[PDB]
Amino acid sequence: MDDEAETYKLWRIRKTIMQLSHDRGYLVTQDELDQTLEQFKEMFGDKPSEKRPARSDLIVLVAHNDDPTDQMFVFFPEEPKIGIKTIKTYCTRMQEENIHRAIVVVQGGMTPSAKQSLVDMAPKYILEQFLESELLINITEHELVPEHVVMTVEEKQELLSRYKLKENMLMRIQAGDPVARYFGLKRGQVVKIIRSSETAGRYISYRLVC
DNA sequence: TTTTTTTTTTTTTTTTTTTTTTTTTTTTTTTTCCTTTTTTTTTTTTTTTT
């Protein structure tokens, strides 16, 4: 019962990770998005107890459409509580592969010293983290979550020039928001929210990531 | 004679409990009662004595 449930939750977490990577604009093929449970069992195995697949076997390397040298690692550590040793191992892998972006799918949580390592390591390499329970649901597919589109600096500048706005006068969204963590939004970006309206059909609002 | 391995000691968070503090619809009209009080010190008065 452990092997089948573990394979099912690993397949669901991998599907959510690949949908998250496709929503961020990274190069993801259609068969990876439409990968079934039986396809996952054929490709990676179905017995997670005897390392089929291993937790280090499910590492996901993905690249961006516009800039092919901007890539993401997705790590799947097997330890439930993550120390500084595995974080340092992943960081050394990031220097020796020259990649600035990675997401660590932790199981239980992280030590606060490792969180401080993520904080002060941040403006050279971005090292995000995600719980396993948070990645069992694609948040953007919920009926209460409208469409979120990340904007470039040109669209933000055009918005502030058109509406005569300053950046502090806009609405705000926290950096710890599940949608902002899903899209990987850093501080200063502006997210465009397109929602359905019952009086005008649809409505576009703008929020500043703080 | 140096390296690993155990022990120690901080270090930062966590979690629960306790404490604190602030709040409690809008307007209007009539009476009643109180707006000192006993204690201590000071000053004047009255009676008594030589």
Compute the distance between CA of residue A90 and CA of residue A111 in angstroms, rounded to an integer: 16
Contact at 8 Å (CB) between A194 and A146? yes
How far does the CA of A59 sit from the C1' of B17, in Å?
45
Method: cryo-EM
β-pairing, A126-131 with A171-173?
unpaired
Compute the distance between CA of residue A18 and CA of residue A39 in angstroms, rounded to an integer: 15
Contact at 8 Å (CB) between A61 and A18? no
Contact at 8 Å (CB) between A21 and A60? yes
Enumerate the β-bridge partners of residue A203.
A195
Cited resolution, angstroms = 3.4
How far does the CA of A51 sit from the C1' of B42, in Å?
106
How far does the CA of A48 sit from the C1' of B12, in Å?
35
With a CB cutoff of 8 Å and minimum separation 6, the contacts of A123 are: none
How far does the CA of A174 sit from the C1' of B23, in Å?
30
How far does the CA of A200 sit from the C1' of B32, in Å?
64
How close are the terminal C-alpha atoms of chain A, in Å? 43
Compute the distance between CA of residue A60 and CA of residue A37 in angstroms, rounded to an integer: 17
The two tokens of residue A132 are: 């396993």
